[PDB]
Amino acid sequence: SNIVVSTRTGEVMRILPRMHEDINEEWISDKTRFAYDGLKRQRLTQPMIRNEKGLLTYTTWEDALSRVAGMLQSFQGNDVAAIAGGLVDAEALVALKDLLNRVDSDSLCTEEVFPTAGAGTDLRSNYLLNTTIAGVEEADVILLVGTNPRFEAPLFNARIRKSWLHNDLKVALIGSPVDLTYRYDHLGDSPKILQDIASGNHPFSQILKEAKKPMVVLGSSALQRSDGTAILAAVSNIAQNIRLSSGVTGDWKVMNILHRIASQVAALDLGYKPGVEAIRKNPPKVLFLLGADGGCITRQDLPKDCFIIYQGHHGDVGAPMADVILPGAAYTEKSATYVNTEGRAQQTKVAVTPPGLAREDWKIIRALSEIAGMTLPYDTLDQVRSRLEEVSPNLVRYDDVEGANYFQQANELSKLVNQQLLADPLVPPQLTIKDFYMTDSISRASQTMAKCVKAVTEGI
């Protein structure tokens, strides 16, 4: 969502909606509006290392960077790995990718799983919301699979409600009977229904077939349940059956994936190997936690004496388990690139500067590369954006949502491996409004969100 940050005398005072007719349309969600006060708490302001007693103590940039460079020079290849967080910009992502490639490492991962079978990351249409947010006004049938749009993407759910109210949309849900703000048709929560819909026996399948311009939306939250490949294959089969029975209607892009992490699409566009399984199958000796506060990898999944480097802006679960802490900048304190769930890249502007000794993320990575001896070819933000255009050119068009449909190839490659589903009901992580507020690192440090959780839990 497009916002206006109102600041006074170098302090972020509030967040307001900024009109964008195609994304948020004059509205923002409560988390977008009221979580800004978490930027004043639990901030990482200085570099920190481990002292003789194993405690974290402040140090200078030279000392921490030299220690990290010395650890990085010793290990090369598969022993070096990196994990990206949920609030990471494309510049830092590409800088870390290049730095780890300089030591012949490819163990770059994200905290969210996306199926790597078949086309995987190669085809951009495979992991995007191809219909786009503005396209929901043109559909008449939408099927949501294993997601809760109200909390995972509140503005997307508001768009769905607008289409439902004005265009008489028909909505069906496969998953837990969560309370969307509108009335939908609950087909059930078993994943097996998908196969039935892909078969043709189900009543809903006929509706999809006879309805021109249908939409099928699969939430990313249902791709982390150890069988997301099978669910994705079944949903792609449903989309293919739609595209075949009615033929190609033109440029409609039935298939859709709805993300909930702001750094995921940029990472995938940079080829960042989604999922943390690569770390588990080949444990590393130098771990680069780039804002990774999901708790996916703890010190029990790593070998003894594993050197862990955390680079972020908040003290959270991922911080105190590290050996060196490098203070980065929050999203309000840098001009950075984030890619939408539709693939629309946008850039932030600097509201205030990072507190204390915190620096820009890509600047930290570039300085580390210089100190380690494998200096990177960019010193200016414009040069880093040129590198981004080299790696993936769609990251420098800052309002373009256009793309090409490669659904045929992805569907063809998804048919190769057909690993079975499991008989577990699709349950979204966001079951109740109390789970909506505190979801990421900035929210958990916020006091307003604590008040909101306490109010929605024990109302009175």
Partner 1 sequence: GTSVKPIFSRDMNEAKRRVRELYRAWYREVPNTVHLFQLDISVKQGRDKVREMFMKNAHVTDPRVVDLLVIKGKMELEETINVWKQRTHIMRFFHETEAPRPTDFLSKFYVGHDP
Partner 2 sequence: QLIAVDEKLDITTLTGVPEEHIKTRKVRIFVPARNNMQSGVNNTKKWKMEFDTRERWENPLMGWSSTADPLSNLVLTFSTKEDAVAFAEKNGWSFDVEERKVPKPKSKSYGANFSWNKRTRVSTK
Partner 3 sequence: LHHALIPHGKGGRSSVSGIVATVFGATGFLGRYVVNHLGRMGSQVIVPYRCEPYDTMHLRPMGDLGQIIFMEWNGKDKDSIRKVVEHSNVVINLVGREWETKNFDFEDVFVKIPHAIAQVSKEAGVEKLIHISHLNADIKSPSRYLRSKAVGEKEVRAAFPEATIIKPSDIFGREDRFLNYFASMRWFGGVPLISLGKETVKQPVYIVDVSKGIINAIKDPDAKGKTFAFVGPNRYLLFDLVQYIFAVAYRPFLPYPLPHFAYRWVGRLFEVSPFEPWTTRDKVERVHMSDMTLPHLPGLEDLGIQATPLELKAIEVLRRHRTYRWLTSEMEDVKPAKTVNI
Q: Interface with partner 2 by CB under 8 A: which residues? A: 2, 4, 9-10, 16-21, 26, 164-166, 168, 335, 349-353, 382, 399
Q: What is the rounded CA–CA span in Å between residue 44 and residue 40? A: 10
Q: What is the rounded CA–CA span in Å between residue 14 and residue 34? A: 8
Size of the site for partner 3 (CB under 8 A): 6
Select 281 or 349, whichever has its Cβ closest to partner 2.
Answer: 349
Site for partner 1 in 356-395 (CB under 8 A): 359-360, 363, 366-367, 370-371, 379-381
Alpha helices in 184-227 (DSSP H): 192-199, 203-210
Select 295 or 393, whichever has its Cβ closest to partner 2.
Answer: 393
Interior angle at CA 24, CA 43 and CA 393, nearest 5:
75
Residue 166 binding target from partner 3, partner 1, partner 2, none, CB below 5 to 8 Å by type = partner 2
Residue 407, classed as helix, strand or coil, is helix
Select 46 or 147, whichever has its Cβ closest to partner 3.
Answer: 46
Binding mask 150-189 for partner 1 (x = CB under 8 A): ----------------------------------------
Q: Which of 6, 19, 41, 45 binds partner 3 (CB under 8 A)?
A: 45
CB of 352 to partner 3, least distance (A): 13
Q: What is the rounded CA–CA span in Å between residue 150 and residue 152? A: 6
Two tokens, residue 311: 């680079």
Site for partner 3 in 354-393 (CB under 8 A): 356-357
Select 58 or 331, whichever has its Cβ closest to partner 3.
Answer: 58
Two tokens, residue 350: 């600097």
CB of 313 to partner 2, least distance (A): 17
Compute CA 386 distance to the chain's CA centroid, rounded to the nearest angstrom. 23
Residue 4 binding target from partner 3, partner 2, partner 1, none, CB below 5 to 8 Å by type = partner 2
Compute CA 449 distance to the chain's CA centroid, rounded to the nearest angstrom. 21
CB of 416 to partner 2, least distance (A): 44
Select 277 or 379, whichever has its Cβ closest to partner 1.
Answer: 379
Q: What is the rounded CA–CA span in Å between residue 100 and residue 284? A: 13
Asked if 353 is part of the footprint of partner 1 (rule: CB under 8 A), the reply reads yes
Select 380 or 419, whichever has its Cβ closest to partner 1.
Answer: 380
Cβ count within 10 A of residue 298: 10
Q: Which residues pair with 229 in a beta bridge?
A: none
Binding mask 62-101 for partner 1 (x = CB under 8 A): x---------------------------------------
Asked if 331 is part of the footprint of partner 3 (rule: CB under 8 A), the reply reads no
> Strands 3-7 and 12-17, how do they pair?
antiparallel
Q: What is the rounded CA–CA span in Å between residue 295 and residue 111? A: 9
Asked if 60 is part of the footprint of partner 3 (rule: CB under 8 A), the reply reads yes
Select 224 or 335, whichever has its Cβ closest to partner 1.
Answer: 335
User: Residues near 426 by Cβ (< 8 Å), separated by ≥ 6?
Assistant: 145, 146, 174, 175, 176, 189, 190, 191, 222, 225
Q: What is the DSSP string of 277-323?
A: HHHHHS--SEEEEES--S--S-TTSS-SS-EEEEEESB-STTSTT-S
Select 60 or 226, whichever has its Cβ closest to partner 3.
Answer: 60
CB of 102 to partner 3, least distance (A): 29
Residue 93, classed as helix, strand or coil, is helix
Select 48 or 143, whichever has its Cβ closest to partner 3.
Answer: 48
Asked if 61 is part of the footprint of partner 3 (rule: CB under 8 A), the reply reads no
Compute CA 349 distance to the chain's CA centroid, rounded to the nearest angstrom. 20
Beta carbons of 172 and 149 less than 8 angstroms apart: no
CB of 351 to partner 3, least distance (A): 18
> Strands 48-50 and 56-58, how do they pair?
antiparallel
Asked if 107 is part of the footprint of partner 3 (rule: CB under 8 A), the reply reads no
CB of 373 to partner 1, least distance (A): 13
Select 101 or 167, whichever has its Cβ closest to partner 2.
Answer: 167
Size of the site for partner 1 (CB under 8 A): 14
In single-letter form, the type of residue at position 91 comes to: E
Cβ count within 10 A of residue 440: 21
Two tokens, residue 327: 């203070």
Residue 379 binding target from partner 2, partner 1, partner 3, none, CB below 5 to 8 Å by type = partner 1
Per CB under 8 A, residues contacting partner 3 are: 45-46, 58, 60, 356-357
Per CB under 8 A, residues contacting partner 1 are: 61-62, 353-354, 359-360, 363, 366-367, 370-371, 379-381
